[PDB]
Amino acid sequence: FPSAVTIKSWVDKMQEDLVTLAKTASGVHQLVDIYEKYQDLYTVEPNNARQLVEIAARDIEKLLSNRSKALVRLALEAEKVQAAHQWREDFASNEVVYYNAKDDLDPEKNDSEPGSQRIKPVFIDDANFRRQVSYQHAAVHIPTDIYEGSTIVLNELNWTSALDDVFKKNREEDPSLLWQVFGSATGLARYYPASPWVDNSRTPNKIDLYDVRRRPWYIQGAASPKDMLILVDVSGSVSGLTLKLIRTSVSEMLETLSDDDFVNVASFNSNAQDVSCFQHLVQANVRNKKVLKDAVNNITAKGITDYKKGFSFAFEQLLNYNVSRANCNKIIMLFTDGGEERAQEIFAKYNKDKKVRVFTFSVGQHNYDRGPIQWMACENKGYYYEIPSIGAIRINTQEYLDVLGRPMVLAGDKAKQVQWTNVYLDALELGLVITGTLPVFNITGQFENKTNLKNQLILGVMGVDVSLEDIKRLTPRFTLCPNGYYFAIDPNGYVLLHPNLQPKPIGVGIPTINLRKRRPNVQNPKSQEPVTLDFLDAELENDIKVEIRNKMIDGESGEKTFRTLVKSQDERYIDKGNRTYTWTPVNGTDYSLALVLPTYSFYYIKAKIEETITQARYSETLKPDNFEESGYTFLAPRDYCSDLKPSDNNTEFLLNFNEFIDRKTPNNPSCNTDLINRVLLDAGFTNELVQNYWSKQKNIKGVKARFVVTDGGITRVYPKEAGENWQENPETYEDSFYKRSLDNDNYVFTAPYFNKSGPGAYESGIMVSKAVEIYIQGKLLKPAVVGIKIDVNSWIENFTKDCKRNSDVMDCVILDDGGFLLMANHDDYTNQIGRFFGEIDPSLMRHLVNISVYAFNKSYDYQSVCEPGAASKQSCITEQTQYFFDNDSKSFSGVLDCGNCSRIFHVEKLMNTNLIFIMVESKGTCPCDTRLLIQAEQTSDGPDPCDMVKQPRYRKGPDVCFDNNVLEDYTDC
Amino acid sequence: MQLFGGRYDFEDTEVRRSNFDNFPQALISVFQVLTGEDWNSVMYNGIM
Ligand SMILES: [Ca+2]
C-alpha cells in the first residue's frame, strides 16, 4: 500500500492539471478582463434590500386593496337588489333568461325548460384566462343533483340577474381581475366572465361534484373559526348500516374544516375514549385530518350506550386551555342513531350558561327514539340533522354553517371584513390562486323590524380571485442573482410565495390503491384540499430560520445575516452559503414579506448602451446563420416586450426575438428596456469573448465544449456540434450548475446523471464551471459563469499515467462533494460514471460518513408523484438525502475492518476544487457488503404527526370572533 | 326474535324488510315463511 507522500504528490499533479486545463481553456480571466475593460457600457447600481421589500409590500397591499374595493361594491349591490325582490312563484309567462354553464354548445338544442331560457354566448378566447371567456353575461353553476326550476332556484336566478352590471363595471375599472363569483346558500354560483364549466354533468362520461357551499373560500367567509369535537357513538346498536354511514359522515364532515379550526374525534360506548393518538384538540390541517380519517375508518361497534360518559369527556376536552385552540366556537357534533336518555344533568353541570353548542346527527334507517336527540340539539343552541342514506351526507354535513353564522349577522356591519384564503388550485384551471371573501346579509324590512326569521342567515359569499402570477409580477427578481428571491408568509406559517411552491397538491402519507376493487366506469372523486406548504417545509430548517419565522409571523420588521445550508436546484448537493433575510409586514393584510439576498448580490449591473450603432452591432450577434462564428446561442424566455410570448422552443423564441428587435426601432415604446439593454450588452460581451479567445484555439486536448452562461439569458456553447448536447435549461436562473458555482469560490464539477436516457457519459463529458468575478469600484460582482465539458477518455488516460486499469491490488476513485462517481480505475465503475458511490461500494461509503468526511442532511418533499403501492400516479412525500463536506481538513488515512478482514484506505481532497481522491484495498479482497446506501427520493410517510402535536410549531390566530350574541333565535331543530 | 333478533347488521345498503327485530315485524316474517312465499330469501339472510 503506497505511502501518504506519494499519494499526496499524485493528487497534487492531478489537481494542478485539471485546474490549469479548465482555467486556460474556459477563459475565466479573459472574460473578467473584458468585463472590466469597458466600465462605460454599464453602471453599478445597489440593491437596497430594505427599500425593495417596502416597495414590494406596498404593491401587494395596493393590489389586495383594489381587490377589496371591488368586493364591498358587489356585496352592497347584492344586498340592495335582494332587499327589493318580490318572490314571485309562477315563472311560466315571465321566463328567467340566463346562461347555465355546463350546458351543450351545439347551437341546435334550444332547451328553454319551464320557467327558464338559456343563452348561446359568443366565447372569444382570452389571455389571463387559459380558456374562452365571454364578457357579456355571467355564467351560472347549479350542482348536479339540484333541479334548476325549483322556485327557490328560479328566484336566486332572478334577483342575481342584477349583479352582472356591477361585475362588468368592476372589470372595466380594473382589467386585470380574474373570476368574480357570488356563491349563494342555495347551491348556485354566479361567476364572471362566463366560461363553460370544465365537467358537464353527463355530456362527458364523468360527473362533477362541485358544491359552492363546501369550498374553502365559502366555508371561510360564512363563519368564524371553530373548536369542533366530533363525538361518534360506537355502541352496539349502531352496528350494521348506521356505522358505515357514520364513518362516511364523519369523514365528509372533517372535509369541511380549515387550518384555523381545531378538531378531535372522541368515541363512546359505556366508556368515552379518543379515536386516535391525539387526546386533545389538534389543528385540522391535511395531515391531522388524514390521521383522524384513517382512525375513524377502523371503528367497530360493540357495547352499551352511555351519553353521560361521552358528554363528560367531550365537555372536558373542550376545556383544556393548556394547548393552542381557536378559542372561538365550541361545538359538539354527536353522531348517533337514537336513544332514550337526554341527560339534563350533564348539560346543567357543564354548560349551564350555554357556551357550547350541540349539533346532533341521527343516522340510518332504524326504529329508535329521536326525542332525546332533538332535545339535546335545540336545548343547547344547536341543531338536529337526519342522515338516512349516502346521498344526504353531503348536504347535511355542511349545513351547520347556517347556525354558526347567526352571530355574524346579528353583529351587522361590524362583521364585514375581507379575508383571504390559503393557496389552492382553481376549479376553472387557472393555477394557484387565493380568494378574498366577504359575506352577504339578507335585509328585508330592515328599517321597520318585520320578520328577522329569514334575516338571521346570510345569503351567500362574494369572492374574487387573485392568481399567484399576479403577485409574482409585483416582486421582479431579475436584478438579483439566481440565489436571491422574495417569499411571503401567512399568520400561520404557511407560504404564499416561494421558489419551491409548485402547482401540485400537497401529498400525505404513502399512496396505496386496490386496482382490483374499482369498476372501470364509476367516476371516482378527485380532491378539494388547499396547497398548504409550511415555510419550514419548503427550505432546509435551521434554528435561525425558526426564529425568523416566529419573528415575522407576528408582524415584525427587521434583518438578519447568517450562514446556512442551501439545497441546490437539482436535489443532489448542499452548499454552505451566506444569506441575508430582510423582512417586513404587509400593512393592509396579515401577510409578511421577506427578501433573501446573498452577500455578493448587493450590487447589480445596469446597461447603458445608448450609441445605437453598438446596440445594432451587438444585436447582430444572436442570429442563427452565423452560429458557426459565435457558437450555439440560447436566450432565456423572459418577457422583454408585450407582443412576443415565451415559446418553450428556444429556436422559435430566438427567431421571434430577433425579428422583434429589428422589427421595431431601438426607441422601445412598449418594451422592458432594462431587460433588453442588459441582454444585448451581455450578448456583446459574450460574443467578443468567443471571437477573440475561443476562436484562436479551435480545439484543445481534453475539452469537449466550452460554454458561457450569463445574466440576461445569453448562453453560448462554442462548437455547434456540442449545441445539440446542452440539456440545461435556457433560463439561466434555473441552471443548477449556475447557482452552485456562484456559491463556491473555486471550480465545481457536476457529475452527470446515470442510467437516464440520453447522451450522458462519453459523448457529452463532465461539466466543470467557475463563476466570473470582477471588482469595479471595490464592489464584488458575479455576472457570468464560464465552463467546460471534459472528455472522459483523455481524463482516463491522464488518470492512469499504484493504479492500473482493471487492477486488482487496489481501487482508485475520484468523487465530488455529493458522493458521485467521476473517474474510476476499474472499467466497470467507469462504466457507471455519475452514480452515487454508496451504490457501488457501500461499506467504504458508510465508513466515510462515519469518520466525518461526508456529512449528510435529510429532508422531505411534500409535493412528489409516485406509483401507488400494493394495499396513473398519486401525490406523495419523498425523503431526500444530501451529502457534503463538513470538515475542512484534507487527508484521511485509515482502515475499515469489515469482519475478520480489513481493507486500508487513504482519501485526499484535491484543493481548489470539490473533488476527493480515494484509494482503497480492492473490494475483491474482502467478500463483505452490508447493503446499498441509496441517495435518491425514497417514498416515505413521516414525520409522525402523533408526536408533532405534542409540541407544535408557532402560530397566531384571527382575533375577530363572532359567537354568542344574545338576541339570537335558536328556536330551530 | 332470539335466533335472528338484531343480527341483520349487514354493512351494505341493501334493504331487508322481512327481519326479526320486534314482535309485530317477527310475526309478519313468520307468516310469510308459513305461506311459503319468498321464504327462501328469509333463509339466506338467516344463514349469512
Ligand atoms: Ca313465489
In 3D space, the residue among A73, A180, A66, A75 whose CA is nearest the CA of residue A415 turns out to be A75
Q: Can you give the length of chain A in residues? A: 973
- The H or E element that residue A795 is part of is helix A792-800
Q: Residues of B at the A interface (Cβ-Cβ below 8 Å)?
A: 8-13, 15, 21-22
Bridge partners, A359 (sequence order): A333, A383
CA distance A388 to A395: 12
CA distance A729 to A482: 13
Listed in sequence order, the residues at least 6 apart from A345 whose beta carbon sits closer than 8 Å to its beta carbon are A308
Characterize the bridge pairing of strands A139-141 and A99-100: parallel
CA distance A22 to A788: 7
In 3D space, the residue among A964, A957, A967 whose CA is nearest the CA of residue A351 turns out to be A964
Q: How many CB atoms lie within 10 A of CB A603?
A: 16
Angle between helices A241-254 and A286-296 (to 10 degrees): 180
A392 — contact with chain B (CB < 8 Å)?
A: no
Which three three-digit cell numbers place residue A39? Answer: 466600465
Cα radius of gyration rounded to whole Å, chain A: 33
Bridge partners, A181 (sequence order): A191, A463
CA distance A581 to A228: 38
CA distance A437 to A752: 49
CA distance A190 to A182: 5
Cα radius of gyration rounded to whole Å, chain B: 10
In 3D space, the residue among A448, A426, A349, A338 whose CA is nearest the CA of residue A384 turns out to be A338
CA-CA-CA-CA torsion sign (A259, A263, A264, A267): negative
Which three three-digit cell numbers place residue B44? Answer: 339466506
Backbone phi and psi for residue A479, each to the nearest 5 degrees, phi listed first: -105, 10
CA distance A2 to A917: 14
Listed in sequence order, the residues at least 6 apart from A867 whose beta carbon sits closer than 8 Å to its beta carbon are A873, A874
Note whether A99 and A137 are within 8 A (CB): yes
Instruction: Report the gap between the CA of A59 and the closest CA in chain B (Å).
Output: 56
Task: Spell out where A90-203 has E strands.
Answer: 96-97, 99-100, 116-117, 124-125, 132-133, 139-141, 180-184, 189-192
- C-alpha of residue B38 to centroid of ligand 1, in Å: 5
Question: Strands across the sheet with A485-489, in order?
Answer: A495-497, A485-489, A592-597, A574-585, A558-567
User: What 3-state DSSP class applies to A947?
Assistant: helix
Question: Strands across the sheet with A226-233, in order?
Answer: A272-274, A262-268, A226-233, A329-336, A356-363, A383-387
- C-alpha of residue B34 to centroid of ligand 1, in Å: 12
DSSP A648-673: SSHHHHHHHHHHHHHHS-TT-SSB-H
User: What 3-state DSSP class applies to A371?
Assistant: helix
DSSP A194: B
Alpha-carbon dihedral of residues A676, A678, A681, A685, nearest 10 degrees? -130
Instruction: Report the gap between the CA of B46 and the closest CA in chain A (Å).
Output: 15
CA distance A174 to A170: 6
- The H or E element that residue A787 is part of is strand A784-790
Cell 314482535, residue located: B23
Residue numbers in the known binding site of A for a divalent metal cation are 233, 235, 237
Angle between helices A792-800 and A4-26 (to 10 degrees): 150
CA distance A98 to A139: 8
Bridge partners, A813 (sequence order): A918
The structure was resolved to a resolution in Å of 3.4
CA distance A762 to A948: 48
One-letter amino acid of A75: A
Q: How many CB atoms lie within 10 A of CB A140?
A: 24
Return the exposure string of A837-846: e unless at least 16 CB atoms fall within 10 Å of the residue's CB, then b: bbbbbbbbbe
Instruction: Report the gap between the CA of B33 and the closest CA in chain A (Å).
Output: 23
Breaks (C-N over 2.5 A) in chain B follow: none
First to last CA, chain B: 16
Backbone phi and psi for residue A787, each to the nearest 5 degrees, phi listed first: -150, -170
- C-alpha of residue B29 to centroid of ligand 1, in Å: 15
DSSP A820: B
- C-alpha of residue B39 to centroid of ligand 1, in Å: 8
**Do A240 and B22 lie within an 8 Å CB cutoff?**
no
State the Cα angle at A557 between A554 and A560, rounded to 5°. Answer: 110
Cell 467521476, residue located: A822
A298 — contact with chain B (CB < 8 Å)?
A: no
One-letter amino acid of A823: M
DSSP B4-36: SBT----SSS----S-BSSHHHHHHHHHHHHTT
Note whether A170 and A177 are within 8 A (CB): yes
Question: Strands across the sheet with A903-910, in order?
Answer: A821-823, A810-816, A915-921, A903-910, A892-896
CA distance A128 to A147: 33
Note whether A183 and A218 are within 8 A (CB): yes
One-letter amino acid of A685: F
Closest by Cβ to B11, choosing from A244, A367, A390: A244
Q: Technique behind this structure?
A: cryo-EM
CA distance A480 to A487: 14
Bridge partners, A419 (sequence order): A437
Note whether A95 and A116 are within 8 A (CB): yes
Note whether A299 and A243 are within 8 A (CB): yes
Cell 390559503, residue located: A422
Note whether A351 and A376 are within 8 A (CB): no
Cβ pairs bridging A and B (under 8 Å): 17
A297 — contact with chain B (CB < 8 Å)?
A: no
Q: A658 burial class (0-12, 13-18, 19+ CB within 10 angstroms)?
A: middle
Which three three-digit cell numbers place residue A542? Answer: 435551521
